[PDB]
C-alpha cells in the first residue's frame, strides 16, 4: 500500500535494532523510554555542539506523477529538558529525501549545512521547528518560536513560543497535519494546563519534496538542553486525491 | 481581556444553571456526563426530527477594526451514538453571531432555515460539520463526510468520513484550529485505534463573521442517532496580530 500508520504510545521497549523501525543518526540515541536527539554526559547532562536525528526507517510515500498525494497527521510528545534559560538550539519535525542525513549542529538543527542554509535551491526539506534561540543571521524573530521551514532555515512563517514554555521543561504534545488537497500544513502545540500554539501555512509538498521521503526528528545544540521524544504516532491517507 | 481559555475534561458536574457557563437551546440538554444535543425518549433512544444547540455563554472575541484577530484552538470528544446504519443527520461545531439561535432540524443541523440554507448572503455562520447523511439537495458528496461550511450548508470543502467511523458509535476526538494570520481553518478527527481525518481550508473569519461570536455545538436529526459531547476545551490567542 501507499499509506503509513504507526503508533508508539511510549518508547519503554528500547530494545529494537537501529534501522529496523527507527534509524538513529549522529548523536541521537535510543534510551529506555525515549528517543534522545543530542548528546549527554554520564549524568543525562547535555553536551554542547551536537546534532542527531531519529527517523522512521521505511520510506514514506508523498505523491506520484499520477496526482495521488498523501495527506498526513503526526502527533508526538516530547520533553525539551532545559538547564537554565535561555538554552540553544531546539528541535524539528522534518520530511527530507530518503538518502539524506544529519547535518550541522547548533542553529541549523541537524538539518542544514552552514554554507547553503539560506539558499532554497540547495535544499529539499520541509520542517516544523521549535527554535529556542534567536539567530539574527537567519532572521529568527526576537523570541523562541515555532516555525515552518521550506528548503531553508529562514522560516516562511513563525509564531511566538513563550519563554516559560520554551525553557520550562514540561512535556508538550504536538500535532502536525498536512492536507494534500488544499496544500496546508498546520502545527498545534499544547501544554497540559497551559496554552496552545497554532501555526498554519500553505505549502505544496509535491512541489518541494520528492515522491517518497524519510520522516523524523532532528535536533541541534547549542547548550544546556536536550530533547527527548516520548511517543510518536503517524498516519497518512490518499483520500480525496482520486485514490 | 480579549481572549478565552476553558477546559471541561468531562461533564460529570451536570449541576450548573442553564446559561451560566453553557447555554442549551432547542432540544439540547445537560445530562450527567454529557451535553446531549437532540432529543431522546425515556430509554436514551433517539427521537426523530429534533434540533439542539449547546454553546458557550460568554461572547468570544474574534477580531476588531484595529486589526487584532484571534487565533484559536478547540478540542472535544464526542459520542455520536447510532441505532443502525445509516443514520441522520450529524452534528457541527460552529461560530455564529451572539444573538442567533437554533434553526431547522434534519440536514440543516440546527444551523440553517430551509428557505435560505443555500444562500451565503442570508447567513453568517462558520461551521465544521460531521454529516452522516447524503442530502443531494445541498450537494453533499456521496458518503458521510466532514465539511467546512461558510454561510451555507453547501460545504466549501469536504473529506470522506468512513461508514464504520460515521456509524460505528465509538468516542471520537476532534481538534479544530484557526490561524488568524494565515486565515486557515484545520479539522483533525481521531479514533483511538483507528484512522485520522484531516481537512483544512483557507477561510478569513473577519470577512464572514462579526467581531464577537457565540461558539458551540449544533445537531439536527433525522433518525436513529443522538450526539453526546463528553469534554470540551477552547483556547484563543491574539498572537502575531500586533497584540
Ligand atoms: C544506525 O544506522 C545507520 C545506517 O542506516 C547508521 O548511519 C550510518 O552510519 C555510518 C557509520 O557507522 C555512516 O557511514 C553512514 O553514512 C550512516 N548513514 C547515514 C544515513 O548517515 C547510524 O550511524 C550513526 O549515524 C551516522 C551518520 C554517524 O553519525 C554514526 O556515528 C552514528 O553511529 C546507526 N546508528 C548507530 C550506530 O547508532
Ligand atoms: C437556556 O437559556 C436560554 C436563554 O439564554 C433559553 O433560550 C430561550 O428560551 C426562551 C423560551 O424559554 C426563548 O423565548 C428564547 O428565544 C430562547 N433563547 C434563544 C437564544 O433562542 C433556553 O431555552 C431553550 O431554547 C429555546 C430556543 C427553546 O427551544 C426552549 O424550548 C428551550 O428550553 C434555556 N434552556 C432550557 C430551559 O433548557
Ligand atoms: Ca535559531
Ligand atoms: Ca447531509
Ligand atoms: Mn528559527
Ligand atoms: Mn454535508
Structural domain boundaries of chain A?
2-243
> Could you write out the three-class secondary structure of B16-57?
CCCCCCEEEEECCEEECEEEECCCECCCCCECCCEEEEEEEC
Nearest ligand 1 atom to alpha carbon A29: 38
Question: In A, which residues are within 8 Å of B72 by CB distance?
Answer: 198
DSSP 8-state secondary structure symbol assigned to residue A106: G
Ligand 2 centroid to residue A65 C-alpha, Å: 55
Fold classification of B2-243 is Jelly Rolls (2.60.120)
Rounded Cα distance between B167 and A47, Å, is 53
Is A16 a pocket residue for ligand 1 (Cβ < 6 Å)? no
Positive/negative CA dihedral, B38, B41, B44, B49:
negative
Spatial neighbors of A47 by CB under 8 A, at least 6 apart, are A27, A38, A39, A40, A41, A221
A96 lines ligand 1 (CB under 6 A): no
Chain A residues whose CB is inside 8 A of the B178 CB are 198
For ligand 1, atom 29, name the residue with the nearest CA: A26
Query: A122: which DSSP letter?
Result: G
C-alpha cell at B201: 481550508
What's the rounded Cα separation, in Å, for the pair B165 and B26?
A: 27
Please check whether residue A67 touches B, CB under 8 A.
Answer: no
How far, rounded to the nearest angstrom, does the alpha carbon of residue B27 sit from its chain's CA centroid?
Answer: 15
Separation of A27 CA from ligand 1 center, angstroms? 9
Q: Is the CB of A26 under 6 A from ligand 1?
A: yes
B129 is in an annotated binding site: yes
All cell numbers assigned to A176: 502536525
Q: Residue A207 — φ and ψ, nearest 5°? A: -90, -15
Check if the beta carbon of residue B158 is closer than 8 Å to that of residue B146. Answer: yes
Whether residue A184 lies within 8 A of chain B, CB to CB, comes out as yes
| 3-state SS, residue B40 | strand
Angle at B10 (CA atoms; ends B209, A192), nearest 5 degrees: 80
Minimal CA–CA distance to A87: which of A175, A165, A176? Answer: A165
Buried b (16+ CB within 10 A) or exposed e, B5-26: eeebeebeeeeeeeeeebbbbb
Between CA A87 and CA B46 the distance in angstroms is 56
Note the ligand closest to the C-alpha atom of B36. Answer: 2
DSSP class of residue B71 equals E
Residue A163 near chain B (CB below 8 Å): no
The answer, yes or no, to whether the previous bond of B83 is cis (omega within 30 of 0) is no
> Which distant-in-sequence residues (6+ apart) come within 8 Å of A79 by Cβ?
A34, A169, A170, A171, A172, A227, A228, A230
d(CA B203, CA B147): 13
Q: What CA–CA distance (Å, rounded) separates A15 from B149?
A: 48
* Cβ within 8 Å, pair B186-A184: yes
Phi, psi of B134 (to 5 degrees): -80, 105
The β-bridge partners of A127 are A94, A149
Q: Does A88 touch chain B (CB under 8 A)?
A: no
Cβ-proximal residues to B164 (8 Å cutoff; 6+ apart), any chain: none
User: Do residues A53 and A28 touch, judged by C-beta distance below 8 A?
Assistant: yes
Min CA distance, B151 vs chain A (Å)?
20
Cα dihedral sign, A231-A173-B93-B183? negative
In this structure, are strands B5-8 and A90-97 parallel, antiparallel, or unpaired?
unpaired
Report CB contact under 8 Å: A200, B188: no
Please, what is the Cα angle at B146 between B145 and B151, to 5 degrees? 115
CA B60-B63-B66 angle, 5° bins: 140
Q: What is the resolution of this structure in A?
A: 2.0
Q: What angle do CA A166, A5, A201 make, to 5 degrees?
A: 45
Helices (H), chain B: 163-166, 205-208
As a whole number of angstroms, the distance between CA A146 and CA A5 comes to 26
Q: Are A210 and A69 in contact (CB under 8 A)?
A: no
With H, G, I as helix, E, B as strand and everything else as coil, classify residue B221: strand
Residues A160, A147 contacting (CB under 8 angstroms): no
User: Chain centroid to CA A210: how far?
Assistant: 18
Q: Do the annotations mark residue B99 as ligand-binding?
A: no
- Which among A187, A196, A147 has a CA at the least distance from the CA of B6? A196
- Residue A122 contacts by C-beta under 8 Å, 6 or more apart in sequence? A116
Q: How far is A179 from chain B (nearest CA, A)?
A: 6
Amino acid at each position: 500500500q501507499n499509506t503509513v500508520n504507526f503508533t508508539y504510545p511510549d518508547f519503554w521497549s528500547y530494545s529494537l535494532k537501529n534501522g529496523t523501525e527507527i534509524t538513529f543518526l549522529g548523536d541521537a540515541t535510543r534510551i529506555p523510554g525515549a528517543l534522545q536527539l543530542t548528546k549527554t554526559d554520564a549524568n543525562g547532562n547535555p553536551v554542547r555542539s551536537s546534532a542527531g536525528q531519529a527517523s522512521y526507517s521505511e520510506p514514506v510515500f508523498l505523491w506520484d506523477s499520477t496526482g495521488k498525494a498523501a495527506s498526513f497527521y503526526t502527533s508526538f510528545t516530547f520533553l525539551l529538558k532545559n538547564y537554565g534559560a535561555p538554552t540553544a538550539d531546539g528541535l524539528a519535525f522534518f520530511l527530507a529525501p530518503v538518502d539524506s542525513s544529519v547535518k550541522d549542529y547548533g542553529g541549523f538543527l541537524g538539518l542544514f549545512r552552514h554554507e547553503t542554509a539560506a539558499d532554497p535551491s540547495k535544499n529539499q526539506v520541509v520542517a516544523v521547528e521549535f527554535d529556542t534561540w534567536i539567530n539574527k543571521d537567519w532572521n529568527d524573530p526576537p523570541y523562541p518560536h515555532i516555525g515552518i521551514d521550506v528548503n531553508s532555515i529562514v522560516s516562511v512563517a513563525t509564531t511566538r513560543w513563550e519563554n516559560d514554555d520554551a525553557y520550562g521543561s514540561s512535556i508538550a504534545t504536538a500535532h502536525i497535519t498536512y492536507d494534500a488537497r488544499s496544500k496546508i500544513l498546520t502545527v498545534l502545540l499544547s501544554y497540559e494546563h497551559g496554552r496552545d500554539y497554532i501555526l498554519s501555512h500553505v505549502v505544496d509538498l509535491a512541489k518541494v519534496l520528492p515522491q517518497k521521503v524519510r520522516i523524523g526528528f532532528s535536533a541541534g545544540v547549542g547548550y544546556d538542553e536536550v530533547t527527548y521524544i516520548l511517543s510518536w504516532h503517524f498516519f497518512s491517507t490518499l483520500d480525496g486525491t482520486n485514490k
